[PDB]
Symmetry: C6
Subunit: 177 residues, 6 copies
């Protein structure tokens, strides 16, 4: 029990997302903290300002999102293996449940991205006033344009995944009827 | 002799923990000491303060926990292989013993985490007075928020593992009766 | 349904491009930002000037181009696998569509390269006036000659791929007639 | 000819030691020299003091110990393969000899550890008076507590291996009688 | 259709070249730019002087040479696979053509090496007068002796390959007659 | 045609040498140049003095030695494969020739080691007077004791290999008679 469009398209988009994350994590986000600098003589201002403006990096968010999204399919695969071992529309039901959970995980991670980083674009200069920085200090972000490009790519792929998951759920409902 | 729920769920949670540890160790905790800095001119204060506040890193604790938790299953696998070679509810007993040992290892590591790092949250600023630091010095922690997020994820997964191991033991007892 | 020349030549050129990208990314472009320096005492000038002159690195552009170009063939492979599973000139049509999409992706990425980096050659010295750099500052690029050589290689291979894709489409049309 | 307990237990402890060494070498001991610093302006004092207090690192000692301990089993495996090829209690004798050699290697490496590093604990501060350091200088060790923890783990595993090897030899003697 | 001497000897020399390149690229040439320093206070002099004296590194030249030399055999392998699929002295001709192309690639890369780096030896001190360096400055090369040794090894292997390719072509001609 | 002792012992010693080289190259010799420092303000003195005292590193010498020693066996393997393909005491002769070549390579590399580094021990302090260093300067070597230990291990293994190769040649001669 599996839709024809979904197995072809969802897997391809997932592989595309994984490949983009691999080519982006190593190089684009590698020096995100080491090259983050602020115009100040205050010790510790660089670290606290980086922590303030980047609570969790985009790459780690995408990695966690991919792991969480792949988890329900992993559970389904283990269940199928154990069923096959025991053999030596309940499956339809658990499959639709897994698809719904994948959709929910994708949507929640998109909302978390909206909360933490309102706006897809990354700015060159940020103003930080966290203790122990005196008054407000200027800090400069590493590769904001390249990071913006990769953010657009990953968000577009995630949105395509969301729409495709809704379409797959609708197809499953139609198959039931 | 193996429960249906356990083989599906415990393995999935274990794989999730391993994946999270892999995506976290390389990047989040990589610069935990190199970017640890203190507001002082005293030579050696950075190293002693880091050693004081981080006796063993979270990542190394999680790695050791995973190795120790996987050890009893490794022993069971070797015993099964050697039994199969010789063939060319004792097994039930050694399986329940291995499950109990896994539960014990998980609980002890959770207690060790409570002892070393009371509180899941990581702070930006720590006060260190270890020799040779004069009086009390301020020191700043690298990526406290991201580390807190990953700590919450790993602790939640470990607690789920503990509850699931208790459930599996109870199921084994019911199977015995 | 596949042309004799294409399967031999396109795959070889693709593998050549991948190998060149692998040998170039690690070493040639690795220190592109860390060794980028400007003649100024202004904090943050190095980072903003690098971001201005290199919105996205050549290596990341080539990696994205390769992923996007390989995507339609990936979709075709998944569709063929699912068709084979179900079995347990529509294919011609989807193959020609995939070839056209590959050609389009290659052409668009060449145009993007023209837009971002007019001229294949990389210069030693660039003049940057982005805020907060005062007036105009001199900045120096890492390994411009080697990067120019690899740019010529990759652009030549991409152009060969474009011509070969057009030839393959023409052969498919002739086969139809 | 192989004991039932040994093949299960020795291999598991060996794998545990290898895993601990892998998780420890990369991160715990990686900055052992680069972060070793002394309170002095004397050029070359850091390097000579590090060489004095750490003639060979713990990780390299453990790696050499594992290689040497695995060597007799490697020779036995090659001999078994060559015997099987030729076929296309001499074996008992060479097996007991290999077990004795493994025990000897483990014991000698434990004695070497006692000689080089008397005491399992690693100290934060060391006093170094090697030329060209003037008088006595203070030097600070990287991650002494974590290194102490991993040292305890590895020494305990090695001692368990020693006891288990003696037990296996005794079982072989009993089998002979 | 393949000569007896060539398949044994050319492949062995190719594997030797690959192994030498692998053991040399990581360590010998890794710090070729980072440890390149000039006796000046002029910003940007180090980078421009390195670019002037090393337009493309020896390691990248050897990597490109190996890829280009292996390309004709890759095309022949793809053609053989496609011929075998279709089956489910034209081959002699394409094989001799591929051998000639391999010889040509090797010779052209040797000539390029002669052009860029006249003389196998690498010097310790170079004199650089590229803008913006004032007058002439002294610059110092990293590991010139080790690089010279590896250059001699790689050039000798390439020359052996050239002679062997000529011998293989002559053998093919004799086989034709 | 192969001796019983040789296939067991030579391969084991070769694997031991490879393992020791792997565990030594990454960590022991990794900072051999970056941590090499001299007591001087003269620019370029560090690099020229390192080049003078370490023309080729021990690790690179051992890697080259292993590649060269494994080459004759590689040629023999290719010849055996091609003979087997054609089939679809000449072999004794080429085998003894390969063994003699292995012995010669090992002996020549030992002599080269004697020439470049007379004495197994590595010293902490070296005196360098190469231009442009003024007069004689003191320079300090990284991890001399650990490097000495690994040098002793590798030289002992190479000497064992030499003796074993002579024994294998003598056995082959006795087999001939």
């Amino acid at each position: 029990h599996s839709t024809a469009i979904g197995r072809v398209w969802l897997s391809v988009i997932f592989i595309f997302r994984i490949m983009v994350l691999v080519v982006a994590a190593e190089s684009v986000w590698g020096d995100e903290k080491s090259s983050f600098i602020c115009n100040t003589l205050q010790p510790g201002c660089n670290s606290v300002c980086y922590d303030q403006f980047f609570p969790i990096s985009h790459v780690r968010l995408w990695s966690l999102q991919l792991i969480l999204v792949s988890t329900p399919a992993l559970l389904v695969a283990m269940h199928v293996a154990h069923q096959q071992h025991i053999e030596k529309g309940t499956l339809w039901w658990t499959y639709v449940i897994s698809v719904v959970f994948r959709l929910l995980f994708e949507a929640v991670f998109m909302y978390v991205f909206y909360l933490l980083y309102p706006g897809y674009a990354m700015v060159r200069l940020v103003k930080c006033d966290v203790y122990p920085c005196p008054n407000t200090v200027d800090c400069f972000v590493s590769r904001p344009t390249e990071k913006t490009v990769f953010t657009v790519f990953m968000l577009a792929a995630s949105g395509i995944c969301i729409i495709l998951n809704v379409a797959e759920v609708v197809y499953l409902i139609i198959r039931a009827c």
